[PDB]
């Protein structure tokens, strides 16, 4: 039996620590996995043997006695934002895997713009798109209450010419009725959020 | 180090048949292993695959319903029998331990993504609608986003990009890390999925910049059988563009 725990939210440039327990002593290796959301798990590094072990801005810790391994991300980035796997390897030849710990490394938000801007219609699609834009890591999108109206978890994009990150939240429907002023009211969004007439 | 080939990629595949994946790898290794994961969820481990006798299944898993045959230590199949669609997953080849290299961890290939439906008449292409920039998102911020909405289809079976004056891009692009269900109730809802390309509002206001939404879509094949008066959804592309405006 190995142990990982679940979701964690990391601010961007700190140090994500990642920590999984075994139950079998005679443990001979363990590994640490990244795992994107449609990839296949990835080896990143693995230890053998008590102490720390440094590749890049990945640090792997264990401690035989006290029955963990650790994976310690410095500097750590938005694309580091990922589920990471403990694998322990017994006695034997056989790798027992944790669960998982699903790592989210949000972005600083130097200059918080919160705004809702409504995109120009397709002349294909029957739908109104609506964009939550620019605002801060800490900020919570909500599911939609409303049935026929469909809002997305906020997303990450990253102009990397400009070294620019920000967040958005896309949410659309077909409803005649439907409006960008109220799109997100399901949400606590910022006061001082902007709404263009 | 060692090259794990998985066949086949994707397969949408009807209630009750059969499907017989296999896992070549480049090298000889000693300790094989078949894995099965939904996206989201955690990493299972099906069976480890014996060379020419029965693999040793863990529990809740039987040979009748997944047999498993390795020949030789670079060969072995893993056959989902009777498919349900609760067998729907990505099914996951491993190898490792001895090598000629020695001792390796073990990697994984890159999976087998199998959708098994009641009735292969509900598998739709999506379609792909591309939104032009705000007006106000421009003045205010002077940074464009366009934003792209596939919508429609079943099964996930769909990988977007976004592809600038012929030119796939990566940067300032965040796409959905999922399909959302429509209708998510239902356990036939199709699936929609967002993403966004924002740019300078000099770029995007430049009429020569051309900008298009791409959607890969994997569907049937051509030895599935299909009698509909609707098009075929095979394995296709459908997509969505627009120029630079000011």
């Known amino acids: 039996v190995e142990q990982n725990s679940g979701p964690l939210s990391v601010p961007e440039g700190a140090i994500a620590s990642l920590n999984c327990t075994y139950s079998?002593?005679?443990?001979?290796?363990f590994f640490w996995y990244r795992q994107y959301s449609g990839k296949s798990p990835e080896l990143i590094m693995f230890?053998?043997?008590?102490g720390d072990k440094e590749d890049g801005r990945f640090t792997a810790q264990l401690n035989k006695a006290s029955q963990y391994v650790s994976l310690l991300i410095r500097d750590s980035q938005p694309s580091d934002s990922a589920t990471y796997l403990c694998?322990?390897?017994?006695?034997?030849?056989?790798?027992?895997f944790g669960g998982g710990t699903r790592l989210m490394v949000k972005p600083n938000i130097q200059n918080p713009d919160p705004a809702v801007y409504q995109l120009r219609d397709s002349k294909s699609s029957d739908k109104s798109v609506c964009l939550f834009t620019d605002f801060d890591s800490q900020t919570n999108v909500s599911q939609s209450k409303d049935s026929d109206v469909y809002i997305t978890d906020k997303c990450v994009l990253d102009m990397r010419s400009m070294d620019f990150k920000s967040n958005s939240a896309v949410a659309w429907s077909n409803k005649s009725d439907f409006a960008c002023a109220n799109a997100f009211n399901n949400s606590i969004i910022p006061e001082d959020t902007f709404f263009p007439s | 180090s060692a090259v794990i080939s998985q066949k086949p990629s994707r397969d949408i595949c009807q209630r009750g048949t059969s499907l017989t994946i296999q896992c070549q790898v480049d090298?000889?290794?000693?300790?094989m292993f078949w894995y099965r994961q939904q996206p989201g969820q955690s990493l299972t481990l099906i069976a480890t695959?014996?060379?020419?006798?029965?693999?040793?299944?863990e529990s809740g898993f039987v040979i009748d319903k997944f047999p498993i045959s390795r020949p030789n230590l670079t060969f072995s199949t893993l056959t989902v029998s009777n498919m349900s669609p609760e067998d729907s997953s990505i099914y996951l080849c491993?190898?490792?331990?001895?090598?000629?290299?020695?001792?390796?961890?073990?990697?994984f290939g890159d999976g087998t993504r199998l959708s098994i439906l009641e009735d292969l008449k509900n598998v739709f292409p999506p379609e792909v609608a591309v939104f032009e920039p705000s007006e106000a998102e421009i003045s205010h911020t002077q940074k464009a986003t366009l934003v792209c909405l596939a919508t429609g289809f079943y099964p996930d079976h769909v990988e977007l990009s976004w592809w600038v004056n012929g030119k796939e891009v990566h940067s300032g692009v965040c796409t959905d890390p999922q399909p959302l269900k429509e209708q998510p109730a239902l356990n036939d809802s199709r699936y929609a999925l967002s993403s966004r390309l924002r740019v300078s509002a000099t770029f995007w206001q430049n009429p020569r910049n051309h900008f298009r939404c791409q959607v890969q879509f994997y569907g049937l094949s051509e030895n599935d059988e299909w009698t509909q008066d609707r098009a075929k959804p095979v394995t296709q592309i459908v997509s969505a563009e627009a120029w630079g405006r000011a």
């Open positions: 079998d002593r005679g443990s001979q290796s």
């Open positions: 695959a014996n060379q020419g006798s029965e693999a040793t299944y």
């Open positions: 230890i053998y043997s008590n």
């Open positions: 491993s190898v490792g331990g001895d090598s000629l290299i020695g001792n390796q961890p073990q990697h």
């Open positions: 090298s000889q290794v000693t300790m």
């Open positions: 694998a322990v390897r017994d006695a034997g030849n056989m790798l027992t």
